[PDB]
Amino acid sequence: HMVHITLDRNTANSWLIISKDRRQVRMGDTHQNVSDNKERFSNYPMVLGAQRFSSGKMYWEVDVTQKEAWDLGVCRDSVQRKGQFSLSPENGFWTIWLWQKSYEAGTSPQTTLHIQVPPCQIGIFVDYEAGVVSFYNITDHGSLIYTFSECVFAGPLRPFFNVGFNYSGGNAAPLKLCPL
Amino acid sequence: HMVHITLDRNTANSWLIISKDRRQVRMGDTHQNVSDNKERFSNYPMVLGAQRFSSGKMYWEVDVTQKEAWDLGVCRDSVQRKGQFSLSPENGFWTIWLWQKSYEAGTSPQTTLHIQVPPCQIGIFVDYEAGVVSFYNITDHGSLIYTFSECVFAGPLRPFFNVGFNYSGGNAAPLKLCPL
Amino acid sequence: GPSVFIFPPKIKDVLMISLSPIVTCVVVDVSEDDPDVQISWFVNNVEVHTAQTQTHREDYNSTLRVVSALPIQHQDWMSGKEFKCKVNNKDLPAPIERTISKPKGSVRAPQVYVLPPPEEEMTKKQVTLTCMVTDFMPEDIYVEWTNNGKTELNYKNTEPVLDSDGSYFMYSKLRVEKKNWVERNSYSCSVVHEGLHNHHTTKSFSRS
Amino acid sequence: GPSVFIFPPKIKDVLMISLSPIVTCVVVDVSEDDPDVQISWFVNNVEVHTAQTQTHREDYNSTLRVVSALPIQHQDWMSGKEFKCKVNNKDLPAPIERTISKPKGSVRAPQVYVLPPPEEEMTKKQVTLTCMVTDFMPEDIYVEWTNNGKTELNYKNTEPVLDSDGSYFMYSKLRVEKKNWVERNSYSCSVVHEGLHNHHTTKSFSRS
Ligand SMILES: *[C@@H]1O[C@H](CO)[C@@H](O[C@@H]2O[C@H](CO)[C@@H](O[C@@H]3O[C@H](CO[C@H]4O[C@H](CO)[C@@H](O)[C@H](O)[C@@H]4O[C@@H]4O[C@H](CO)[C@@H](O[C@@H]5O[C@H](CO)[C@H](O)[C@H](O)[C@H]5O)[C@H](O)[C@H]4NC(C)=O)[C@@H](O)[C@H](O)[C@@H]3O)[C@H](O)[C@H]2NC(C)=O)[C@H](O)[C@H]1NC(C)=O
Numbered sequence: 001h002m003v004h005i006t007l008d009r010n011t012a013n014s015w016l017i018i019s020k021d022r023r024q025v026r027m028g029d030t031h032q033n034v035s036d037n038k039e040r041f042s043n044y045p046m047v048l049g050a051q052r053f054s055s056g057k058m059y060w061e062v063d064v065t066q067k068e069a070w071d072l073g074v075c076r077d078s079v080q081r082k083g084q085f086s087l088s089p090e091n092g093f094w095t096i097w098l099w100q101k102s103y104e105a106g107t108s109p110q111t112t113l114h115i116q117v118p119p120c121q122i123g124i125f126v127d128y129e130a131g132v133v134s135f136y137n138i139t140d141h142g143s144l145i146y147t148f149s150e151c152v153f154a155g156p157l158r159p160f161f162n163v164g165f166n167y168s169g170g171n172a173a174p175l176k177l178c179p180l
Numbered sequence: 181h182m183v184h185i186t187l188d189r190n191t192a193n194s195w196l197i198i199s200k201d202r203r204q205v206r207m208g209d210t211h212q213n214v215s216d217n218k219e220r221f222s223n224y225p226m227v228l229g230a231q232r233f234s235s236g237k238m239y240w241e242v243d244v245t246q247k248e249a250w251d252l253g254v255c256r257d258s259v260q261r262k263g264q265f266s267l268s269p270e271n272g273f274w275t276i277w278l279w280q281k282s283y284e285a286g287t288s289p290q291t292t293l294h295i296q297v298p299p300c301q302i303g304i305f306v307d308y309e310a311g312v313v314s315f316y317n318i319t320d321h322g323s324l325i326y327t328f329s330e331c332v333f334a335g336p337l338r339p340f341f342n343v344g345f346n347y348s349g350g351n352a353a354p355l356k357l358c359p360l
Numbered sequence: 361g362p363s364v365f366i367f368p369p370k371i372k373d374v375l376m377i378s379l380s381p382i383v384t385c386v387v388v389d390v391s392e393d394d395p396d397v398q399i400s401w402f403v404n405n406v407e408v409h410t411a412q413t414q415t416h417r418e419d420y421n422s423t424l425r426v427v428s429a430l431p432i433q434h435q436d437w438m439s440g441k442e443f444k445c446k447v448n449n450k451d452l453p454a455p456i457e458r459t460i461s462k463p464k465g466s467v468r469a470p471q472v473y474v475l476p477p478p479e480e481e482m483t484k485k486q487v488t489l490t491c492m493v494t495d496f497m498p499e500d501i502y503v504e505w506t507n508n509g510k511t512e513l514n515y516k517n518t519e520p521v522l523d524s525d526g527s528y529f530m531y532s533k534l535r536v537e538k539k540n541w542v543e544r545n546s547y548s549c550s551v552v553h554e555g556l557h558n559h560h561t562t563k564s565f566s567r568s
Numbered sequence: 569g570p571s572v573f574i575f576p577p578k579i580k581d582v583l584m585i586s587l588s589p590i591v592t593c594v595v596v597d598v599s600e601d602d603p604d605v606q607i608s609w610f611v612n613n614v615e616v617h618t619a620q621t622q623t624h625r626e627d628y629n630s631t632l633r634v635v636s637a638l639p640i641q642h643q644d645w646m647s648g649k650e651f652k653c654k655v656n657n658k659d660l661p662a663p664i665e666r667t668i669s670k671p672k673g674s675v676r677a678p679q680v681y682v683l684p685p686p687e688e689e690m691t692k693k694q695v696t697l698t699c700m701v702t703d704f705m706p707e708d709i710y711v712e713w714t715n716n717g718k719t720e721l722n723y724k725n726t727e728p729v730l731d732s733d734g735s736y737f738m739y740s741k742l743r744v745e746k747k748n749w750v751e752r753n754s755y756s757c758s759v760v761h762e763g764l765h766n767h768h769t770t771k772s773f774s775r776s
């Protein structure tokens with residue numbers, strides 16, 4: 001059920017650098033000189049995919065090679081963009097993440113993931129009608145990482161991405177939407 | 181039901197100075213060179229009356245003229261003598277006090293007393309069988325100050341006195357057991 | 361005479377992408393006879409020329425005080441860059457240098473809990489909510505309160521305390537009108553610490 | 569060179585009849601060349617000769633440090649007596665005096681509350697009890713924990729904080745084994761403050 005995801009520039013935190021083909025994104029060292037608007041995530045290095053789904057089964061892959069922090073998943077079209085907020089199904093996000101050498105699911109409170117083989121690429125699967133978001137380890141033969149079930153999508157969904165801050169210097173590598 | 185109370189030297193905090201007739205007591209400026217024993221209140225300027233009651237009605241008066249702090253009442257023979265403790269019926273004390281310009285009953289938590297005419301002498305009335313301790317304002321024609329009722333004396337009672345610390349200098353005056 | 365102190369930026373100015381972290385050199389005991397002070401700044405020994413150096417404020421002792429504030433890059437603080445200020449003045453037998461950097465250390469995210477008022481307070485005009493933040497390293501942390509996004513005026517934090525397992529804790533106290541704590545209403549303790557996912561967590565609750 | 573600091577006694581040593589309150593003068597930056605320091609003490613300008621003056625401890629900076637401790641009377645502290653130390657030493661162009669007394673101020677007894685652990689902690693190895701002490705003036709206060717008279721090892725107090733009505737508050741945190749917080753057991757926060765009847769109150773509770 002692969003689907004071709006591209007990034008929506010208008011939603012990107014103004015510090016992100018998005019390739020021309022809109023298939024890659026990296027955190028830049030400076031504010032990036034794009035105009036402000038209401039869609040654009042203000043406080044975190046996040047960005048949405050241009051696509052919006054309201055039914056069916058969708059699958060896509062993301063390359064996280066060499067990255068020390070990121071968030072990935074899907075989220076409601078109507079999620080909060082400005083100010084401080086947490087990723088949780090209550091707030092409209094079904095995500096997992098890598099943060100300081102742990103993998104977590106974005107439940108509230110968060111759930112510790114048990115991943116044997118650290119992934120360099122992740123597959124995200126949404127089944128709208130079944131109310132399911134699942135995450136898969138492609139490096140490890142597509143083994144399951146996490147499944148959100150009974151989800152209350154309550155509207156259109158968008159692919160969701162957090163490139164991570166790179167205050168450390170260890171997280172410059174980009175997220176890449178993977179060669180279908 | 182007046183009764184002639186004298187102080188029990190052996191119970192006196194070692195800083196108290198008790199007159200020869202054992203009818204007055206004042207807080208001294210120095211440790212007072214009396215031998216330690218298990219009866220003697222260690223931490224506070226307190227002392228008991230020599231008398232012990234287990235029945236009947238008893239009444240006595242105490243002069244508090246010019247004093248800025250004191251505790252008065254009755255208490256179980258078996259009350260705690262050493263270390264830190266609070267005066268409350270749970271701990272075996274039915275008392276009232278003057279502390280920093282307020283009059284309180286020693287309930288827990290403590291109860292604010294409403295006294296129109298500050299007293300220079302107080303009458304203490306115990307009715308063992310009725311389970312009652314009451315306090316009276318002699319300066320104000322013996323008007324009622326406070327009545328503890330349904331008391332659980334659970335043993336012999338002793339008249340109880342706290343002369344007050346006098347770290348301030350404003351509380352040197354003694355307690356006097358009043359001319360019957 | 362004169363003396364120099366160097367101060368880190370606020371942890372919140374570093375973590376929050378839109379804010380501006382600053383490192384500060386403060387020179388005290390500058391005599392009114394010799395007011396001119398030259399201050400040079402360096403990041404990893406690379407001289408920079410961006411500091412705001414404020415009109416040498418006057419002080420009681422009848423001395424002057426020189427405050428120089430270097431705005432820095434978020435990445436430079438967290439990456440462990442060295443920030444150095446070099447201070448010259450006639451009365452100094454030779455320049456004074458001060459250096460500061462973010463120290464390496466373990467990073468442990470705080471556990472954050474909100475506690476409801478104690479029972480006896482339940483009948484008072486105001487009540488007191490308590491945010492308890494434990495288990496965190498390093499000690500730098502920012503805590504505040506809100507209620508539906510309106511940031512609260514009347515809270516006070518304690519300073520952090522070295523707990524016995526070598527981590528830090530602190531408490532934050534919020535006074536609110538009893539009325540509020542009953543009808544509807546939501547109160548939230550927000551904490552910013554470098555160990556927390558996306559730098560922040562908020563803990564919430566209300567009327568039980 | 570040398571400098572003098574004066575320190576009050578602990579409020580608990582003053583309030584508790586059996587303890588010994590001390591006022592302290594600390595002279596730092598005493599050079600190793602000129603180690604001898606003469607320290608004179610006065611109570612309301614009346615010289616006294618009772619201070620323990622400790623073998624001028626050695627310090628890193630390669631300087632000496634002189635610590636002189638004057639034991640005082642409980643009544644002298646609370647009555648507002650002035651305690652003065654006068655310091656002579658060759659390198660001092662003239663004697664240094666420091667004075668300290670207990671300042672007048674309003675006296676407000678603290679409200680003391682104990683808070684049970686937060687819900688989520690209820691399933692952890694240790695839990696955390698919180699003593700919250702608010703509304704007190706002046707800020708000097710002593711807080712500790714016990715459980716049936718056994719004084720607890722593992723609690724930490726915050727420093728007091730100037731609250732917004734001009735009073736002080738603080739918190740005290742006690743870590744205990746979850747096991748304990750269930751079966752029987754009693755825990756008590758004891759507070760010593762000059763505004764409290766007989767100087768002390770203890771607040772208690774356990775397993776609800
Ligand atoms: C003659 O009088 C002078 C004043 O009388 C004397 O000056 C004093 O000299 C002392 C040395 O003997 C100095 O002691 C040092 O103090 C250090 C702590 O200083 C900080 O805190 C104290 C209060 O606790 C405060 O008074 C100081 O101003 C200073 O405050 C800090 O200031 C920094 C920089 O401004 C702030 O950090 C910045 O904050 C801004 C925003 O505001 C941005 O966020 C920036 O990013 C950030 O970098 C900081 O927030 C602020 N902190 C607080 C709590 O306010 C201490 O570490 C040393 O160990 C040492 O003890 C004393 O500071 C100094 N006082 C002043 C006001 O100058 C002088 O000595 C005397 N002369 C003689 C001969 O005796």
Ligand SMILES: *[C@@H]1O[C@H](CO)[C@@H](O[C@@H]2O[C@H](CO)[C@@H](O[C@@H]3O[C@H](CO[C@H]4O[C@H](CO)[C@@H](O)[C@H](O)[C@@H]4O[C@@H]4O[C@H](CO)[C@@H](O[C@@H]5O[C@H](CO)[C@H](O)[C@H](O)[C@H]5O)[C@H](O)[C@H]4NC(C)=O)[C@@H](O)[C@H](O)[C@@H]3O)[C@H](O)[C@H]2NC(C)=O)[C@H](O)[C@H]1NC(C)=O
Nearest residue numbers: 573575576577578589590591592594596597627629631633
């Ligand atoms: C060369 O090196 C020397 C050391 O390197 C430098 O000495 C330092 O000089 C500073 C001045 O530039 C001094 O700053 C002052 O500090 C005051 C606070 O000092 C107290 O707290 C600090 C820690 O916060 C502590 O290091 C000090 O020792 C001191 O601690 C207090 O000590 C008193 C008296 O001993 C204690 O009070 C007594 O306690 C006993 C029981 O223990 C009884 O209860 C007594 O009844 C009671 O009186 C007190 O409890 C204790 N407090 C704590 C928290 O420990 C501050 O007020 C001033 O404003 C000023 O900032 C600094 O103190 C000094 N350090 C030392 C260790 O001497 C020297 O300057 C340097 N030379 C040069 C040229 O730079």
